[PDB]
Amino acid sequence: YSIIGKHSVKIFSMLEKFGQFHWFYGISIGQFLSCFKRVFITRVDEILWLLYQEVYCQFSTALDKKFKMIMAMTMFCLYKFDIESEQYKEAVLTMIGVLSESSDGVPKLTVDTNNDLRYLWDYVTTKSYISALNWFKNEFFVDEWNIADVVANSDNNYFTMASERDVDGTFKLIELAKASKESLKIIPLGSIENLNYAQEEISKSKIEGGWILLQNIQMSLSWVKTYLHKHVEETKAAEEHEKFKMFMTCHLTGDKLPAPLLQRTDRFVYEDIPGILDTVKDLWGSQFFTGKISGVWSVYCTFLLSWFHALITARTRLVPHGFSKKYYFNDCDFQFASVYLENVLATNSTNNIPWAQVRDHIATIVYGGKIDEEKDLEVVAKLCAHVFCGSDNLQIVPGVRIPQPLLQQSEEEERARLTAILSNTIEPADSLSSWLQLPRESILNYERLQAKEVASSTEQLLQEM
């Protein structure tokens, strides 16, 4: 058991160190024990491996894709370094060293000796990075939990999912509730009315047993430390109360939540990123709920914007090679651009040529407002050049051509026609280089960097213990 015991500390020490780095990455000793208890319900060897599997399956969910992968690589080195040969240890460390830029050399080749490990070197040598990074997860042979699975296993009434500003799992939670156990109640924390209504709907829902969500807690935080800190601590009767589940939404990049509260509540990182085309379809999708307020020609501009926004946001992710730094573009930025679009049609003639100042205003005030680096400001602009000026056929992306309103001038026809152009397109394999004008070479450079980050942080973590 000492042999089991020694491993579990270095495991917990690793999970602990993630909490030092980032606030949301806490782990408690009881979390670790509850996890280790699960492992039961050469025997010592199997139980050990049952731990490393179980630890991966439970604590993976509460980390982001980077930390998922650092935990995988580290855990693999914590296990296979002790168990496997010293021949093994330097071969895998030499490979982690190529993935980081620490060193580059070729490991021990032994025919039939190691094939799993011979298969990794193939990934690293083929310069295929993301696959090499995942190899450490796969090597654990675990069926990796969905937020859903987590929720089903969990019997806690509280949950906090942090997420990057790129997304909001608000809509994941909607389909999670609808598919089983219904009872979805979205509560925005805005002003005093919202907080005031909020705390009312909280106390009532727990007795009723409905699901509740507290959208974007970070913003309302001063209140959290006063009301929620007391309230969630007091509510050990919430365990006694009807099957009910409360959810809270954070942002990782942003104001730091209290650790005690955070540890009480289950944790997930919504890491789930939509396609360019899918976001086009999600954007265009809602715009029909308005009714009909604007003319046929506008619908075209609104479709254009739907593409534009879905292209800049996709480009946001890929830095450095893409934008210089991480910029976040919102639904608010879409709204202000559409507002100006309705207005430029309301103030101008139905001649198509108003297009020049549509570019400038969208690229320098509406979206270029936040942008501070001149390098990036030209990117926004060159994209407006492409999305906004164009005659009759645009070809926003290589597959798809966007044709200008027809003489028939039907707005219901045009919706159907522009929805049809979306349904016909299939977003290619290489979308991030083919659709966002940027070259493939740059995409790989990005892939290489995120590899480098996981491999570095693991080297560092191994030496530290």
């Binding site: 913003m219 202000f336 507002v339 205003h361 005030i365």
Partner: protein
């Protein structure tokens, strides 16, 4: 509340309210009455607005009621004056007519509306060219009207110029467009001011379009504010602000400070007829005031801007941020009433909130999450320069403003790409704003041309370039634009400059004339000047020379104030306000302004005032006066004023580096970079010689002087010295100073040595005379180049000198001396003659005792020669090398000079210097120098500052205490820190000692200070002179045991061998406290004497053991571990065997030789068993009488008790114990003190102890030691030293025998009085004030005993104790750091002395202890 109450109270009067309006309006300053009626109002700017209806005022009227009518009429009055004017210009009336009768706000709005409408139609026709010239004419028309204008209306024309230039600029851009589409894009981005001639509600009739969006002009008065020059970037800010506001979103711009984000919010308000309220956030700003202000804004429907929102405290910021959301959420929805600060207040929908966000330490600050969805963030950027250049050129009087702006930018841009990367180089727009600002006065001389641009370029750009880049300038200036061949003011200034220098001593070199010219041309335009260069560049010469040359050329007198910036505190210099009585006291920089501003009783109006800051300049100091450096030209008090500075009043800055200062500070001022020293090596010496000759003229006849100057001229030529100064560099220089700055040291010495033998020059042979000169010149030239050298280097340099001087001329020897008869004339040069010293047994240790050597006399002579020159001396060298002794003995011998020792520590204040001096110096108001600080007696005073490279430096890194001495050496007096005037010190000299700056603890000193010093490196001597020296020391003490007179030399040789070995075996490579010096030898020599003078008749076996014990206590007590401790046991053995071969020795280990005077009446070797038993009978007693503490008496402890005993017995007893923890170092000290009959003082310090408290604890123990004759033992622990100052006080108590600060002023007089009481009581009168304090000090030195207990010397705080030289040198260091295995077993045995246990297998007790 306060101001509100005054208004309601003052209602009867009405007139009193005008003061408060300025606050609740922002635009207006005071209200105008006929008393019955309000005729109008005036703005803070000066502009007079008259109302349409003058409001009548009566007893039965409320302030509420009358003021509310005023607000309404004031806006209506604006519409009136607007339509009145707009209609006029519609009927083609010239703008010059309108200006005189319409308020700016009204005429501005009218121009905008008419312009916009005239350009709107011009887009249809495309008749741009014809409207353009038309406007261009109005531009010139307004420009010439400005020159003929009353200053108040001069603001109005200038403000309108901002606008009319913008007008023509837009039309011009429109003229240029490729197509009509291109023109209609450009036009959409502009702010278009329209009118409704269709509907009523006239205050709602004027509206503004931009980017497709409209914004209704609210009518509110703005006055005539200085209008922001229109840039594309400006319009874009205006464009975002309108796009945010249209959707009911708040505007927010983040960016670097100095981008004018608030200026923009201000401007954008004004353009729409609003006075935007700016909340400067976090400037001691209450939340309750802002919560007030917020409600006021939501009711009045005003515009609020949070100027640098980021700088608010988390508590405040949450509260504010939450409030703002309510408002922005209320507007977005349009809720009539919204709740904020838990009150239902109504919200005007005219309301808007703006947040400027300056960057923090990380980068650009952020909005709280709630505000992110409520505001719209924008990135302010500095404007591309080209655009601002053109406009600024256009306002001043254009010529071709388009091409000058191209050309200026290209040039500045080209400089950046072509010049070297230098730290102080700025070719940023700040620089072109400066070149442009410099242009205005320059136009007055020449034209509104490129040639005036050209001259401004070379006025600002050139003085800051360094020689390589100085041609890059000339090459690209002529490449871009070639303007003029010759300069005006070429002859007239120059002759006024040369005549000033001939009088000053100076030589007109290519460079000195250049840098003199560059300066002259700068003072003209620039009010603040910066002079940067290598220390001794000639900067104080250039400016003092130009300044002087202007009183000859203009005829205007100068009044110069040189202030060392960093010697004084910001409070001492700018203005200090005192906590409780909040009394405003002047300071230094503000008080000298009051002579010019407050009381120009004499001529200050016709005079020029110049305020020079010699010292290194830092942000904190320049920031406190940034307002004078601003366009303001006014000084801002911390509380209670702005004081205006005239154009007479110039600020200079001379410094050596700029690394600390801000590019912002530079570009307000004019920078004069001194690339090289102004003048030739020869030319410096030339001036220097003549300056030296002048000193002598007041103590030497013309016949003597004429003849001595004839000698100097023919003895040394430049060709010789050239190679000597070249070779000076090929040498290793400790405390290095550059060759050029060595010259004052040379010539001053040379002149003094020659003027010394002046009587012997009357009759002496003309061949022989030359040789006397040449020898002294060769000598003085040696110490001035090679004095700070190894002397191993000096010897080699002596030949280098001989080489390059003429071959026949008298050669220099290592110990060369000149010899002359006392009463009868003789000549010849013979060397190295030494007196023989006899001193008795008691004389062996004496604070004033030096054994003359080949080197002692050599050093004492040169050191003394420098004082006669009156040059500052810096003695550098390792500890124990004799800097202190050589200095002290050369001066304790002479009647001329009188010495005062100041011992410097890590943190010494400049007042410490002054307090120490106040006993020996006397202020007298003699007319010769106003206040003077001469010495309190008639003959010269010498301040010896020991450890001058020890005091620390500002966070920027500048040691003020050093700069204070630099002030004394260069300026000759100093500014009084409290009373605030100049005191010129009379006949006081600076001499300092310091360790090499490669040594740890040591701080590097400023070449600006060390340039004034002759530097002498003194090392250790021989290992063979040391042996000679201490032989005479043993000789003296062996007058007590004459039977061993044979044995004095082998004892002296042994002592030195042990020294040599300890120093080599145990160095600072093993432990930091392994630091040995001849001080230890002198401690050993005396330590032997003391045992003899109070011991039984000594056998040869006794004496060697007596010597061995002292050798142990002086060299090995400090040694750590056992490997080194055993090493010394064998070393001691090894040394006796080589020098004193005997068979009578015993075990020489410290444990076996125990010497004490506790049992014996004499200091004798005692028995191990006799001592242990004596301690045991005394420890019971000490246990019972004092603190009850059980301990085991063991072998080590007895040895240690004797260590402390000898320490506490010596007259000056300082011992520091290093004991880890639990060793009992603190208990043993208390015990040995109690045995010796010493009062045990242990500072009762605690968490809540101030310095004053510890000051008290010290002061008492000091006063009880002299006035009560206490014989106290002061135990200071590492815990006791709470601040750094505590330890600094402890130093002063050791290095000197008193703390001067404790007893100063009145507390000095009280002590002085009490002292005379006790002095008389004991039976002596002491005549002088100095004679009494010298007893007081001498009493402390023999009654006060400081014992230090530090546990881990590895700790950084306990490191500082050991580090401190004062403590380390004047203490006996002892090591108790670990328990020995033998002492562990010994202690364990006595503890298991009680026997519960019974026989066992195996001893039973012996086994348990071993586990």
């Amino acid at each position: 509340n306060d101001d509100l109450l005054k208004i309601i109270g003052s209602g009867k009067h009405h007139d009193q309210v005008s003061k408060f309006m300025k606050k609740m309006f922002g635009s207006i300053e005071s209200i105008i009455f006929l008393e019955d009626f309000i005729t109008g109002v005036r703005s803070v700017e000066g502009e007079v607005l008259n109302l349409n209806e003058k409001i009548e005022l009566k007893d039965s009227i409320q302030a509420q009621e009358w003021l509310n009518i005023l607000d309404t009429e004031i806006k209506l009055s604006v519409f009136t004056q607007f339509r009145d004017c707009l209609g006029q210009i519609k009927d083609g009336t010239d703008i010059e007519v309108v200006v005189s009768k319409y308020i700016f706000q009204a005429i501005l709005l009218s121009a905008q509306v008419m312009w916009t409408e005239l350009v709107e139609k011009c887009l249809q026709t495309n008749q741009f060219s014809k409207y353009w010239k038309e406007v261009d004419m109005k531009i010139k028309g307004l420009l010439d009207k400005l020159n003929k204008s009353s200053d108040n209306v001069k603001k109005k024309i200038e403000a309108l110029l901002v606008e009319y230039l913008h007008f023509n600029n837009v039309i011009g851009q429109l003229k240029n467009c490729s197509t009509k589409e291109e023109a209609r894009l450009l036009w959409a981005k502009v702010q278009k001011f329209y009118q409704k001639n269709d509907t009523l509600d006239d205050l709602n009739s004027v509206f503004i379009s931009q980017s497709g969006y409209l914004l209704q002009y609210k009518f509110e008065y703005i006055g005539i504010p200085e209008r922001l020059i229109y840039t594309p970037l400006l319009l874009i800010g205006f464009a975002t602000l309108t796009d945010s506001l249209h959707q009911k979103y708040g505007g927010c711009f983040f960016g670097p400070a100095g981008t004018g984000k608030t200026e923009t919010v201000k401007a954008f308000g004004q353009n729409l007829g609003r006075v935007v309220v700016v909340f400067n956030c976090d400037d001691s700003f209450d939340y309750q005031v802002l919560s007030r202000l917020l409600v006021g804004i939501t009711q009045i429907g005003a515009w609020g801007c949070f100027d640098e929102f980021n700088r608010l405290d988390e508590k405040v910021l949450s509260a504010v941020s939450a409030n703002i959301q309510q408002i922005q959420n209320g507007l977005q929805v349009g809720k009539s009433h919204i709740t904020l600060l838990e009150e239902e207040t109504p919200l005007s929908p005219h309301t808007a909130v703006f947040i400027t966000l300056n960057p923090g330490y990380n980068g650009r600050s952020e909005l709280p999450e709630n505000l992110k969805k409520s505001f719209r963030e924008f990135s302010m950027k500095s404007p591309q320069s080209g655009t601002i250049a053109e406009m600024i050129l256009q306002i001043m009087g254009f010529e071709d403003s388009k091409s000058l702006a191209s050309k200026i930018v290209h040039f500045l841009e080209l400089l950046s790409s072509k010049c070297s990367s230098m730290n102080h180089y700025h070719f940023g727009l700040r620089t072109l704003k400066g070149v442009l600002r410099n242009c205005s006065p320059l136009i007055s001389e020449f034209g509104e041309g490129e040639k005036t641009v050209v001259e401004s370029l070379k006025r600002v750009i050139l003085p800051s370039l360094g020689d390589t880049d100085e041609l890059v300038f000339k090459d690209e200036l002529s490449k871009i634009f070639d303007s003029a061949g010759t300069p005006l003011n070429s002859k007239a200034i120059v002759q006024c400059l040369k005549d000033a220098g001939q009088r000053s001593g100076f030589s007109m070199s290519e460079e000195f004339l250049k840098k003199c010219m560059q300066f002259y041309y700068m003072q003209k335009t620039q009010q603040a000047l910066i002079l940067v260069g290598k220390a001794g560049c000639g900067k104080t010469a250039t400016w003092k020379t130009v300044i002087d040359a202007m009183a000859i050329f203009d005829g205007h007198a100068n009044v110069v104030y040189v202030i060392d910036t960093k010697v004084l505190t910001k409070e001492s210099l700018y203005g200090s306000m005192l906590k409780a009585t909040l009394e405003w006291r002047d300071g230094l920089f503000t008080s000298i302004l009051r002579r010019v501003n407050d009381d120009i009783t004499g001529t200050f109006k016709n005079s020029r005032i110049w305020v020079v800051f010699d010292s290194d300049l830092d942000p904190e100091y320049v920031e406190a006066m940034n307002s004078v450096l601003d366009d303001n030209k006014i000084l801002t008090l911390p509380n209670g004023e702005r004081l205006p500075i005239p154009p007479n009043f110039r600020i200079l800055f001379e410094t050596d580096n700029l690394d600390h200062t801000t590019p912002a500070t530079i570009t307000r001022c004019g920078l004069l970079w001194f690339s090289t020293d102004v003048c030739s090596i020869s030319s410096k010496i030339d001036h220097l010689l003549n300056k030296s000759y002048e000193a002598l003229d007041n103590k030497l006849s013309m016949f003597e002087l004429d003849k001595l100057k004839d000698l100097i001229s023919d003895s040394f030529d430049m060709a010789s010295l050239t190679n000597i100064f070249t070779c000076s560099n090929d040498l290793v220089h400790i405390l290095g100073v550059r060759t050029f700055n060595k010259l004052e040291t040379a010539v001053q010495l040379a002149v003094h040595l020659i003027s010394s033998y002046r009587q012997w020059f009357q009759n002496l042979d003309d061949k022989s005379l030359k040789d006397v000169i040449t020898l002294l010149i060769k000598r003085s030239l040696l110490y001035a180049l090679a004095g700070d050298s190894t002397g191993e280097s000096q010897r080699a340099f002596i030949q280098t000198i001989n080489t390059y001087f003429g071959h026949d001329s008298q050669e220099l020897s290592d110990y060369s001396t000149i010899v002359i008869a006392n009463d009868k004339l003789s000549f010849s040069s013979f060397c190295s003659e030494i007196p023989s010293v006899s001193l008795e047994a008691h004389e062996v240790m004496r604070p004033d005792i030096v054994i003359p050597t080949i080197d002692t006399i050599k050093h004492e002579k040169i050191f003394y020669d420098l004082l006669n020159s009156k040059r500052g001396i810096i003695l550098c060298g390792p500890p124990g090398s004799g800097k202190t002794m050589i200095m002290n003995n050369a001066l304790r011998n002479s009647s001329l000079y009188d010495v005062v020792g100041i011992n410097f520590s890590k943190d010494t204040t400049t007042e410490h210097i002054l307090s120490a001096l106040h006993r020996h110096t006397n202020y007298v108001t003699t007319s010769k120098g106003l206040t003077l600080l001469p010495k309190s007696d008639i003959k010269n005073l010498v301040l010896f500052c020991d450890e001058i490279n020890l005091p620390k430096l500002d966070k920027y890194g500048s040691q003020n205490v050093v700069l204070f001495l630099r002030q004394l050496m260069e300026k000759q007096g100093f500014w009084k820190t409290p009373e605030n005037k100049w005191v010129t010190i009379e006949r006081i000299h600076i001499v300092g000692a310091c360790n090499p700056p490669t040594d740890p603890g040591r701080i590097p000193m400023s070449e600006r200070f060390t340039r004034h010093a002759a530097i002498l490196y003194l090392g250790y001597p021989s290992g063979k002179s040391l042996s000679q020296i201490y032989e005479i020391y043993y000789k003296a003490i062996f007058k007590l045991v004459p039977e061993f007179r044979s044995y004095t030399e082998p004892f002296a040789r042994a002592s030195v061998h042990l020294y040599n070995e300890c120093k080599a075996r145990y160095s600072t490579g093993l432990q930091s406290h392994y630091l040995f010096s001849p001080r230890e030898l002198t401690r050993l020599v005396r330590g032997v004497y003391t045992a003899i003078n109070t011991g039984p008749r000594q056998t040869l076996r006794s004496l060697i053991r007596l010597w061995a014990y002292e050798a142990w206590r002086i060299f090995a007590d400090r040694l750590v571990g056992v490997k080194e401790k055993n090493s010394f046991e064998q070393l001691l053995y090894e040394t006796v065997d080589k020098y004193l071969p005997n068979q009578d020795l015993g075990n020489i280990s410290s444990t076996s030789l125990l010497f004490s005077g506790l049992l014996s009446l004499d200091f004798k070797e005692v028995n191990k068993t006799d001592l242990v038993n004596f301690i045991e009978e005394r420890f019971k007693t000490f246990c019972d009488e004092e603190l009850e503490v059980p301990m085991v008496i063991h072998e080590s402890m007895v040895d240690h008790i004797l260590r402390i005993d000898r320490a506490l017995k010596q007259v000056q007893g300082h011992m520091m114990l290093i004991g880890a923890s639990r060793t009992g170092k603190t208990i043993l000290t208390r015990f040995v003190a109690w045995l010796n009959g010493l009062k045990i003082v242990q500072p009762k310090i605690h968490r809540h102890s101030n310095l004053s408290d510890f000051d008290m604890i010290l002061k008492k123990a000091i006063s009880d030691c002299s006035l009560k004759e206490s014989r106290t033992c002061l135990i200071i622990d590492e815990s006791n030293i709470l601040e750094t100052a505590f330890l600094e006080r402890m130093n002063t108590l050791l290095a000197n025998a008193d703390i001067p600060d404790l007893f100063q002023g009145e507390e000095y007089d009280k002590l002085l009085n009490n002292l005379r009481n006790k002095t008389r009581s004991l039976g002596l009168l002491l005549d002088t004030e100095q004679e009494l304090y010298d007893w007081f000090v001498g009493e402390i030195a023999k009654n006060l005993h400081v014992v230090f207990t530090i546990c881990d010397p590895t700790n950084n705080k306990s490191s500082a104790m050991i580090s401190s030289p004062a403590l380390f040198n004047r203490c006996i260091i002892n090591w108790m750091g670990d328990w020995d295995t033998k002492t562990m077993s010994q202690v364990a045995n006595n503890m298991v002395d009680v026997i519960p246990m019974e026989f066992t297998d195996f001893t039973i007790r012996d086994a348990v202890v071993n586990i």
